[PDB]
Amino acid sequence: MNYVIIGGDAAGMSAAMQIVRNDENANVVTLEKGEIYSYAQCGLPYVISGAIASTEKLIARNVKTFRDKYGIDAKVRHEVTKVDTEKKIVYAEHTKTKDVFEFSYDRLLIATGVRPVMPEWEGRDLQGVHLLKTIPDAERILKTLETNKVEDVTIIGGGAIGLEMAETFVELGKKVRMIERNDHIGTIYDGDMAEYIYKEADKHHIEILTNENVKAFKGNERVEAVETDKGTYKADLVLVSVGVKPNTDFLEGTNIRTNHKGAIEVNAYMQTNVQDVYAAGDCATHYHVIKEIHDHIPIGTTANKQGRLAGLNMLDKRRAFKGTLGTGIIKFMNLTLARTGLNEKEAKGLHIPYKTVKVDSTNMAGYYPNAKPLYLKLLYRSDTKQLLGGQVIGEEGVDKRIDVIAMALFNKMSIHDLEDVDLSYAPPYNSVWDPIQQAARRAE
Amino acid sequence: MNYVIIGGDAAGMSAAMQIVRNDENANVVTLEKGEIYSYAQCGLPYVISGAIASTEKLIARNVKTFRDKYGIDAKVRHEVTKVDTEKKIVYAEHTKTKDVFEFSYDRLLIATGVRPVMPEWEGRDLQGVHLLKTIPDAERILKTLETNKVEDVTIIGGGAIGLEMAETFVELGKKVRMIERNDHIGTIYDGDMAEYIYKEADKHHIEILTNENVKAFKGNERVEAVETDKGTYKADLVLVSVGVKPNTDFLEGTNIRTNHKGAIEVNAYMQTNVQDVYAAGDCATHYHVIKEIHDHIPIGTTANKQGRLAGLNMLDKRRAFKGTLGTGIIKFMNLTLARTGLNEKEAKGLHIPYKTVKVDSTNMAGYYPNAKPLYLKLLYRSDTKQLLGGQVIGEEGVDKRIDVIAMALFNKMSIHDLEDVDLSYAPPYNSVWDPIQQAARRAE
Ligand SMILES: Cc1cc2nc3c(=O)[nH]c(=O)nc-3n(C[C@H](O)[C@H](O)[C@H](O)COP(=O)(O)OP(=O)(O)OC[C@H]3O[C@@H](n4cnc5c(N)ncnc54)[C@H](O)[C@@H]3O)c2cc1C
Ligand SMILES: Cc1cc2nc3c(=O)[nH]c(=O)nc-3n(C[C@H](O)[C@H](O)[C@H](O)COP(=O)(O)OP(=O)(O)OC[C@H]3O[C@@H](n4cnc5c(N)ncnc54)[C@H](O)[C@@H]3O)c2cc1C
Ligand SMILES: CC(C)(COP(=O)(O)OP(=O)(O)OC[C@H]1O[C@@H](n2cnc3c(N)ncnc32)[C@H](O)[C@@H]1OP(=O)(O)O)[C@@H](O)C(=O)NCCC(=O)NCCS
Numbered sequence: 001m002n003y004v005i006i007g008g009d010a011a012g013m014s015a016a017m018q019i020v021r022n023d024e025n026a027n028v029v030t031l032e033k034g035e036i037y038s039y040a041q042c043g044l045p046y047v048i049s050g051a052i053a054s055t056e057k058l059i060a061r062n063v064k065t066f067r068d069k070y071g072i073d074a075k076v077r078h079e080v081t082k083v084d085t086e087k088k089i090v091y092a093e094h095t096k097t098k099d100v101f102e103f104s105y106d107r108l109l110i111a112t113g114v115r116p117v118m119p120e121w122e123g124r125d126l127q128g129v130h131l132l133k134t135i136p137d138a139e140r141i142l143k144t145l146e147t148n149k150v151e152d153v154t155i156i157g158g159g160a161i162g163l164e165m166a167e168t169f170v171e172l173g174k175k176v177r178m179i180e181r182n183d184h185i186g187t188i189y190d191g192d193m194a195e196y197i198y199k200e201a202d203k204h205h206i207e208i209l210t211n212e213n214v215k216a217f218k219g220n221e222r223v224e225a226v227e228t229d230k231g232t233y234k235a236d237l238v239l240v241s242v243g244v245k246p247n248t249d250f251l252e253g254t255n256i257r258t259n260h261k262g263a264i265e266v267n268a269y270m271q272t273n274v275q276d277v278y279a280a281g282d283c284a285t286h287y288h289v290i291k292e293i294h295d296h297i298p299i300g301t302t303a304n305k306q307g308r309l310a311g312l313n314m315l316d317k318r319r320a321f322k323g324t325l326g327t328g329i330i331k332f333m334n335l336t337l338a339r340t341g342l343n344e345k346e347a348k349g350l351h352i353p354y355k356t357v358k359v360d361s362t363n364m365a366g367y368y369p370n371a372k373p374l375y376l377k378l379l380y381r382s383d384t385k386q387l388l389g390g391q392v393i394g395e396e397g398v399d400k401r402i403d404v405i406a407m408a409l410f411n412k413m414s415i416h417d418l419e420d421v422d423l424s425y426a427p428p429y430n431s432v433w434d435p436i437q438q439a440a441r442r443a444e
Numbered sequence: 445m446n447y448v449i450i451g452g453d454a455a456g457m458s459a460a461m462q463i464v465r466n467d468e469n470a471n472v473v474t475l476e477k478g479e480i481y482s483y484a485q486c487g488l489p490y491v492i493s494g495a496i497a498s499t500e501k502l503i504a505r506n507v508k509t510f511r512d513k514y515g516i517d518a519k520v521r522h523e524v525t526k527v528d529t530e531k532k533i534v535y536a537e538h539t540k541t542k543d544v545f546e547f548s549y550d551r552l553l554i555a556t557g558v559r560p561v562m563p564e565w566e567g568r569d570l571q572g573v574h575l576l577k578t579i580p581d582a583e584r585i586l587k588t589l590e591t592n593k594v595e596d597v598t599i600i601g602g603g604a605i606g607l608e609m610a611e612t613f614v615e616l617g618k619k620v621r622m623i624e625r626n627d628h629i630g631t632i633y634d635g636d637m638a639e640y641i642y643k644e645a646d647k648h649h650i651e652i653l654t655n656e657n658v659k660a661f662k663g664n665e666r667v668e669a670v671e672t673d674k675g676t677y678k679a680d681l682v683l684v685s686v687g688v689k690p691n692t693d694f695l696e697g698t699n700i701r702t703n704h705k706g707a708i709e710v711n712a713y714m715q716t717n718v719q720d721v722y723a724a725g726d727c728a729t730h731y732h733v734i735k736e737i738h739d740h741i742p743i744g745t746t747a748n749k750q751g752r753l754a755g756l757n758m759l760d761k762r763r764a765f766k767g768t769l770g771t772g773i774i775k776f777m778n779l780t781l782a783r784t785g786l787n788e789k790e791a792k793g794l795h796i797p798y799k800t801v802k803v804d805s806t807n808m809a810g811y812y813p814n815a816k817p818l819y820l821k822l823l824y825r826s827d828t829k830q831l832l833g834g835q836v837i838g839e840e841g842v843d844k845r846i847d848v849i850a851m852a853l854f855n856k857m858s859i860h861d862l863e864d865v866d867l868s869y870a871p872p873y874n875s876v877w878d879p880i881q882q883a884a885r886r887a888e
């Protein structure tokens with residue numbers, strides 16, 4: 001009967017849809033801190049570039065639909081500040097009036113996602129210093145682009161948001177610099193594959209500063225410079241994209257177990273250790289198919305999967321989450337960057353004995369016009385030969401190959417079994433042996 | 445030590461390479477009727493269109509390479525006319541001098557592939573009436589185009605070659621007509637998916653004549669008209685594109701078992717019923733993963749796989765062929781046409797209880813620019829839900845989806861298991877749920 005969901009996006013609303021469809025007697029209350037439900041965070045960098053007309057295009061399902069069509073009591077501007085899991089009561093503040101509302105539950109779902117991290121640097125609050133998470137976040141970047149003379153842009157963090165936004169700011173015709181604490185950008189990539197990223201950014205005149213630590217943002221009313229341990233550089237707009245943190249702060253005091261980064265531990269059924277409390281999405285842990293422990297790889301695909309499952313499991317339609325593979329894909333200028341399963345640092349960290357194969361080949365028949373380079377790397381166990389991970393980088397046909405590799409990892413295939421799959425071939429799409437199959441043959 | 449291989453292309457030479465690499469003592473004789481080894485039949489339609497410079501670009505490995513680098517005794521213009529399996533002797537006739545040569549073997553592989561069928565119509569032999577199989581075939585088609593004023597082109601048979609060449613002739617700026625014996629072109633496609641094919645052809649002004657039967661080709665020294673049961677049409681060049689027959693004729697009188705089509709029956713290890721005789725490629729049968737029966741789906745991916753395997757098995761490096769899935773992919777004008785596993789006709793013929801799901805979707809996030817329609821159909825067992833087959837049609841992202849479906853079929857996945865795979869998502873590549881997963885959700 002009484003279902004409460006905290007967070008009105010991918011994981012939360014996937015759960016809501018499941019409950020609503022499979023229980024007519026259910027009273028669904030969803031509590032969202034912001035004013036916007038079910039939107040596509042993935043489209044943000046492409047709204048900022050101007051490729052998409054507006055942020056309005058990123059709304060998947062508006063609140064009126066949730067209320068009128070599905071009978072969900074979708075609350076906006078309700079921030080949850082406390083949960084009493086014993087009395088089964090959720091306490092929410094109104095973000096404007098600051099008045100306090102309570103919501104009784106039979107089953108609770110926490111789907112509060114993650115927020116971007118802003119390190120405690122001087123000048124972090126200066127105008128023109130931006131994090132990117134939400135539609136308003138994007139609009140505030142658009143405001144800085146609209147109302148100011150922006151020519152130099154500095155990005156802190158050479159990960160997923162930093163890479164895509166480097167494209168966006170290049171496309172908007174800015175002089176882009178990226179500052180990365182670690183040894184290379186695309187840190188989820190092995191050293192040898194990361195080289196391809198550095199070449200592409202270099203080619204488009206993106207200054208990459210590696211092993212460099214930001215100390216302060218300098219400026220008056222606005223940012224005008226970024227100070228590091230190695231120098232001070234003019235900046236008209238600073239994007240901070242240095243990772244994220246689970247929105248699980250408000251749970252301190254509930255006995256709900258979290259891992260070291262604050263992600264809520266869930267079992268196969270999206271259940272926490274506390275009775276009738278569930279979690280899903282970026283705020284939760286993600287059982288890893290290959291690592292065989294609970295990881296934290298916050299991503300939209302996983303969030304919808306976990307959200308859907310949490311909903312079903314809350315209805316007692318028992319269904320286990322099979323896990324993440326750590327898949328990820330990024331468009332970066334002319335390159336597509338794809339990975340899945342284990343990279344070399346993950347395999348090493350786990351003390352799993354592995355070997356690698358790397359093939360430089362083409363996306364399609366070498367004789368065909370506009371066949372393009374494809375760089376493909378695979379990891380596999382030394383003993384059993386079980387496929388462990390893949391990294392694919394190139395201009396075209398990269399998403400295809402990572403999806404096939406993901407399929408192989410999901411099914412725990414040996415690397416040599418790939419040789420046997422009847423994958424498709426015609427000249428405009430592949431070679432008579434797919435690059436994955438050629439790599440598999442090179443394997444021991 | 446004495447290995448004899450009949451056929452110098454994909455299946456035959458894949459076998460040759462395995463033997464050569466894994467037995468330094470071996471005497472390999474390969475017997476090829478034509479003059480060209482290891483070439484890409486797949487690139488022929490794209491040579492004729494002018495997209496590829498010449499047929500030279502289609503040679504993967506030279507006979508000179510085979511002889512000098514690998515020490516294979518590669519024979520050209522050697523047509524095998526009979527085999528004595530008791531004496532272990534192969535009889536080859538030189539195609540020019542007509543001289544007969546004997547070759548004794550310890551182990552024999554037959555890799556003679558298939559040949560295009562020319563029905564016994566009047567006018568068969570008129571200049572400008574062409575089959576397409578070989579590089580000389582391609583050259584003859586170009587010879588007609590160079591020396592003859594070609595305006596109207598008529599293609600007989602609306603299968604794989606008819607489809608690709610219909611594009612090739614359109615691109616060369618010709619008026620193209622297609623005449624098909626049964627109800628629709630792309631007969632391997634279900635009626636409902638085939639609609640998309642005749643919409644694309646129509647769009648490009650390709651006349652499709654269905655349930656219509658060629659009666660004769662009319663003309664002087666050269667072809668000038670095609671005659672059917674329904675009319676007579678101007679044609680300056682006729683491509684006959686009506687299917688293929690195994691080149692196994694010369695084995696009559698041996699006890700080597702063939703299926704009804706004349707394809708040579710092989711066990712897991714590419715062995716025929718006759719001691720020390722092996723077969724591989726288009727001339728042999730193809731165990732079907734889903735049908736669980738020996739099929740005949742002649743294709744180059746399978747040919748190379750079977751060839752490689754025959755070579756290994758001939759060396760007593762025992763390895764079973766896992767089967768075909770009947771995967772096929774075609775570029776047709778602006779469409780990519782892909783299928784794998786069972787269609788409805790195949791499932792019905794086998795009396796496997798099945799159901800279907802069809803999704804009209806996009807290749808990538810619906811809000812992203814130039815996201816294109818994607819039409820996707822899946823068949824699955826009504827009882828176990830085992831995935832049985834897929835058909836995918838659209839302008840982009842089709843090869844990706846069919847490869848993923850192929851992976852699912854190879855691993856005998858249930859249709860709903862697809863929902864659980866961590867497939868890649870970013871906006872330029874996919875939607876947060878892949879079309880395959882959305883189809884899977886609709887399934888019972
Ligand atoms: C720029 C960008 C690009 C991305 N691109 C991709 C991509 O290409 N592919 C991909 O798979 N993923 C991508 N992602 C990630 C993906 O968008 C997220 O993984 C997904 O949104 C997670 O869903 P969720 O429901 O767990 O969390 P969110 O979507 O973050 O939803 C959590 C919601 O909970 C609310 N909330 C938080 N705390 C409270 C509280 N105390 N009380 C009430 N409500 C609260 C928040 O307001 C928020 O709306 C991208 C993210 C960004 C920022
Ligand atoms: C136009 C066209 C496009 C194609 N496109 C694709 C595609 O996109 N993707 C794909 O996977 N496949 C494609 N194929 C099919 C693919 O090329 C074949 O399946 C593959 O070549 C089969 O290899 P094979 O070694 O079994 O037979 P073949 O390649 O046909 O080789 C057999 C050889 O044996 C020789 N031979 C025959 N009889 C004798 C004899 N009596 N004595 C001595 N030698 C003999 C022949 O001369 C021939 O060279 C295409 C085919 C054509 C015609
Ligand atoms: C060209 C042809 C002889 C290829 O033979 P092949 O054995 O598949 O390929 P190669 O001879 O190049 O060797 C591949 C082997 O070398 C190894 N290898 C290749 N490159 C390597 C490298 N750079 N470093 C180390 N090893 C390598 C691979 O691991 C593979 O080993 P395996 O055969 O034990 O699995 C054969 O495909 C053919 O005749 N084709 C006709 C053209 C065709 O394919 N037509 C059909 C089109 S539809």
Ligand SMILES: CC(C)(COP(=O)(O)OP(=O)(O)OC[C@H]1O[C@@H](n2cnc3c(N)ncnc32)[C@H](O)[C@@H]1OP(=O)(O)O)[C@@H](O)C(=O)NCCC(=O)NCCS
Pocket residue numbers: 009010011013014017018038039040041042060061299300301304876882885886887
């Ligand atoms: C929009 C959102 C609510 C979608 O919820 P959803 O349940 O996945 O999708 P729908 O509500 O459309 O329902 C789909 C269900 O209806 C069924 N269905 C869909 N179309 C159908 C049709 N035409 N006929 C019959 N059944 C249909 C499906 O089989 C599916 O069934 P299941 O839920 O039992 O598997 C959710 O994804 C969301 O809020 N997302 C936020 C945006 C986002 O995804 N962000 C992250 C991007 S990185």
Ligand SMILES: NC(=O)c1ccc[n+]([C@@H]2O[C@H](COP(=O)([O-])OP(=O)(O)OC[C@H]3O[C@@H](n4cnc5c(N)ncnc54)[C@H](O)[C@@H]3O)[C@@H](O)[C@H]2O)c1
Pocket residue numbers: 116119156157158159160161162164179180181182185186187212213214241242243244297298299300328329330331869870
């Ligand atoms: N298409 C995609 O997969 C995609 C795209 C964009 C965003 N996202 C989502 O957003 C989340 C967060 O993105 P993100 O880029 O903020 O995190 P991230 O983990 O992708 O990138 C963080 C980067 O910042 C670096 N860093 C940390 N501290 C730093 C410092 N002090 N100075 C300089 N660099 C520092 C890290 O080394 C790392 O390279 C991802 O986990 C993902 O869920 C996904």
Ligand SMILES: NC(=O)c1ccc[n+]([C@@H]2O[C@H](COP(=O)([O-])OP(=O)(O)OC[C@H]3O[C@@H](n4cnc5c(N)ncnc54)[C@H](O)[C@@H]3O)[C@@H](O)[C@H]2O)c1
Pocket residue numbers: 425426560563600601602603604605606608623624625626629630631656657658685686687688741742743744772773774775
């Ligand atoms: N990309 C690819 O997969 C691809 C492309 C080209 C060729 N090929 C290979 O070539 C082989 C044969 O190609 P194909 O196109 O010759 O055969 P096919 O089976 O693909 O097409 C034959 C077509 O001819 C029709 N037909 C038969 N008799 C007819 C008649 N009397 N009048 C009119 N139509 C008639 C059939 O109904 C069928 O539609 C395929 O099996 C495949 O191995 C594959």
